[PDB]
Design a protein around this ligand. Structure first.
Ligand SMILES: */C=C/C1=C(C)C(=O)N/C1=C\C1=NC(=C\c2[nH]c(/C=C3\NC(=O)C(C=C)=C3C)c(C)c2CCC(=O)O)/C(CCC(=O)O)=C1C
Ligand SMILES: */C=C/C1=C(C)C(=O)N/C1=C\C1=NC(=C\c2[nH]c(/C=C3\NC(=O)C(C=C)=C3C)c(C)c2CCC(=O)O)/C(CCC(=O)O)=C1C
Lengths: 482, 482
């Protein structure tokens, strides 16, 4: 179900944010084709009068002088009689898009940000866990942006997420540890956040500035603002902000090894514009954490596969120390369990089933033993909520909430099945997950949930997720029984 | 220790660089105890008549106006009539040492180094290899320092180095590809370089400034200048550079997982001083490179593991469904070799040897098995130069230069032994390695080597080195068959 949320084009709403001015040109003569209605407060004259006119007679000479560097570097600073603006330049719908927004005024900013990078690299980060690695990356970003609250938000495989870190001001509420639906950040949004990694909402109460003309004439549609720094956002999202009593919003995507792993959302309770220069420096921090997270993770996985392979070697040094099948896998009982972080093992070596640890009844292992043999897997099968696919043992989630089965022979149903009990998790949801929006009668005008107060849900009948190492240790064992 | 170049106390040389003043204070009354003889250059009044004078009456009020900002940070900018300077504070031998140094004049340093941090931390970096990673880092440090040549030095196991990357200006001598002896950077300096990661020589030809008094009166020795920016390097080094044609040297240790991976060296043909702050943003980049290298490198070891584990996966699917062990290893001999990237394998299941691929003859293999039997290895043995420990097959480096053996049995003689042939290398040195230093009659006066021209050499009887992924799969094979 691709809902109403996952529909309307957020890149075709046709408004810009009032703290800036948008101009679009087409042609070798670069005649103004698309103008935002507030254009006058800079250009001088009625916007309607400057459509159809080449750049030379609409743009100030303060800016055209630096047009070449604008074209080559994509952005240049320009001082006007109004103040210091930053000219941004890109391409869209075959037209040239120009944006003026206020520039950075405080000149020891890059110095300051060069010092938050030293903190986020250091000799080495992630000392006592990646938790304080995200907590620093949150602190650094608050210190640089001046925002009252900064959360690290992670995405889960269902595309729901959780605040894993939070650096806020004293006397402020916090969303630490809470959980959030997938409809909160829809799919079309996550599609373009994985392309354009920044977004600033200076004033959520403010009214978007329309563009002129309302369509691109040669197209019958509005100008594609997917790469605009001043594009104004969906209306139903400005209300979700107001129902949190926030006033400004800045978010950066956390792209690590290709995918959208999460966001760094920044909340302020009064409007605040952050210079495009200050946001690029923040982007330098977010990429920094994303590289730290990657090197820490692989290192954990490597060390987690060296201890598992220490076990595989102890199994074999013993299994060859004496002819003793039934006996060693019994005398070395905890070295098999710990191979997959398991609590009971059922080994199908024909004959009878050698039951080790806490394990389901011999006539119940013989029940999944017969169903698994008619399941579509090749070498391994792992469920973390078995009861849902195999309900007969849905009441035995005390020993069989999750399973990890390996085939010890091609045909000839010969398996090694590790078992895990459930692990009960209470997740707190920021507001009711079942009514996470308010539709109006006719179900054609959705609104957001107005309460983000805790909602608690103990999760049952699920086990711990089978990590990557458990699974490799399983198939390593497999090449030692055949 | 081993040689004289290791004896030299390169931290008690009593000299500093003429582009700066050093002053050391001690006591509740910050009495001046040690001072550089050039201190009168920037203080006014001869350095001898201010010794034992409170800090108040010796320093300029321009410097003392920031005396509290100076302490709690350890760095600050002051404007003397002599010019803008950087004051830096640190404690050595119960003394408060303060070092005055010309400060940075180009104000967009921090904006420039941000852009170069952006380049080296961006994702998609290392995509054409880690060669492009060091090449990017050498090109970026050159853009900030402005040196005429910036090279990447990697120490090997034996502490000699080579140049794996290089970035230089048009028409200049390079050292790409070349190898440099262990004696060129001696052990007492490596140790120090693990702890102070940035050093700078501004005039390879300027003579040191003495410190007055020649000693610290309470010790009998001079001031320890371990954590010093203005310290003068040993005179044996100064000759080295002046026989190299360099006029200024600046280097940054590449500390990787806490150990000294290598060094980024930069050469200018003329004297050049880099500001303290610019040396600290270059060191930012050394830690991005250290990070980037650690992450990439962990990604490959994993991808290596996956291939081997699959090779272990298919053999054990060959096993348990096709006759004896002498047959399935006859139809997967291309996998049993590939396990350890081997040219041949000799398995000993207790029968006569079963030789696979390119091996030495049955008798040569048999003889080695009875040799290794005495040897004191637990479950694994490996060498890249067998002939150095077992000469009987020192003629056979065409098949047996390097070997990897695993014990397939407890207190018994059952092994699987993979075989590699030699891989002739070719080390092109910067000078003849047997003449690394040229002493005078008597040997209490050493002189740098005079000629840095390519001295080629071709190492033989040496195989490709048994890596982590190979060894890991060697033990995997051990745990599979009986
Ligand atoms: C049916 C529609 C929607 C419901 C219901 C809902 O809750 N959101 C809906 C649509 C959109 N959400 C968009 C963006 C967006 N959502 C989040 C998540 C949060 N945003 C916040 O402001 C907070 C807290 C205050 C949270 C937890 C984020 C981070 C974003 C990105 C924008 C930002 O950084 O503020 C969205 C797209 C907006 C656009 O056009 O840019 C839509 C349509
Ligand atoms: C017996 C003495 C020595 C011989 C012979 C020799 O070749 N070196 C000897 C001693 C020391 N070398 C020290 C420092 C140093 N050496 C290198 C290596 C190079 N420096 C270069 O300039 C080049 C190329 C021209 C190479 C290959 C480096 C990088 C360093 C560090 C200093 C720098 O980067 O400029 C040394 C340390 C002296 C000190 O630090 O006080 C000694 C004693």
């Amino acid at each position: 179900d691709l809902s109403q949320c996952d529909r309307e084009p957020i890149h075709l709403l046709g408004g810009i944010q009032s703290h800036g001015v948008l101009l679009a040109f087409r042609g070798p003569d670069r005649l103004l084709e698309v103008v935002s209605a507030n254009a006058q407060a800079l250009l001088g004259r009625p916007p309607e009068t400057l459509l159809g006119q080449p750049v030379g007679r609409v743009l100030p000479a303060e800016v055209l002088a630096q047009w070449e560097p604008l074209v080559a570097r994509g952005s240049v600073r320009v001082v006007l009689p109004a103040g210091a603006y930053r000219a941004l330049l890109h391409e869209s719908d075959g037209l040239t898009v120009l944006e003026l927004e206020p520039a950075e005024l405080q000149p020891g900013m890059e110095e300051t940000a060069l010092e938050v990078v030293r903190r986020l690299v250091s000799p080495l980060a992630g000392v006592k866990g990646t938790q304080a690695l995200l907590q620093t990356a949150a602190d650094t970003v608050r210190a640089l942006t001046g925002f009252d609250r900064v959360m690290v938000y992670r995405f889960d495989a269902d595309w729901h997420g959780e605040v894993l870190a939070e650096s806020k001001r004293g006397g402020m509420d916090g969303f630490l540890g809470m959980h959030f639906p997938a409809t909160d950040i829809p799919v079309q949004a996550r599609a373009l956040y994985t392309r354009n990694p920044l977004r600033l909402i200076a004033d959520a109460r403010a009214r978007p500035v329309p563009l002129l003309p309302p369509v691109v004439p040669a197209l019958g549609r509005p100008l594609d603002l997917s790469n605009s720094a001043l594009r104004s956002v969906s209306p139903v999202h400005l209300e979700y902000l107001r129902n949190m009593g926030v006033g400004a919003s800045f978010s950066l995507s956390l792209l690590k090894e290709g995918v959208l792993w999460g966001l760094i959302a920044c909340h302020h309770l009064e409007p605040l514009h952050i210079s495009h220069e200050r946001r690029r420096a923040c982007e330098v921090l977010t990429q920094l954490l994303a590289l730290q997270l990657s090197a820490e993770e692989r290192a954990a996985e490597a060390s987690e596969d060296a201890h598992r392979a220490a076990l595989l070697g102890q199994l074999a040094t013993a299994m060859g120390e004496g002819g003793t099948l039934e006996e060693v896998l019994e005398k070395e009982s905890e070295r098999v369990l710990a191979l997959t972080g398991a609590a009971g093992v059922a080994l199908l070596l024909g004959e009878e089933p050698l039951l080790v640890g806490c394990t389901p009844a011999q006539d119940e292992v013989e029940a999944l033993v017969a169903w698994l043999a008619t399941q579509p897997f090749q070498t391994s099968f792992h469920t973390d909520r078995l009861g849902t696919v195999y309900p007969p043992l849905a009441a035995r989630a005390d020993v069989a909430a999750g399973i990890l089965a390996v085939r010890l022979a091609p045909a000839a149903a010969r398996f090694a099945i590790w078992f895990r009990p459930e692990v009960a998790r209470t997740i707190s949801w920021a507001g009711n997950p079942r009514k996470p929006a308010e539709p109006e009668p006719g179900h054609q005008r959705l609104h957001p949930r107005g309460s983000f107060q805790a909602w608690e849900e103990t999760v049952r009948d699920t086990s711990l997720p089978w990590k990557r190492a458990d699974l490799g240790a399983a198939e390593g064992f497999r090449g030692a029984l055949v």
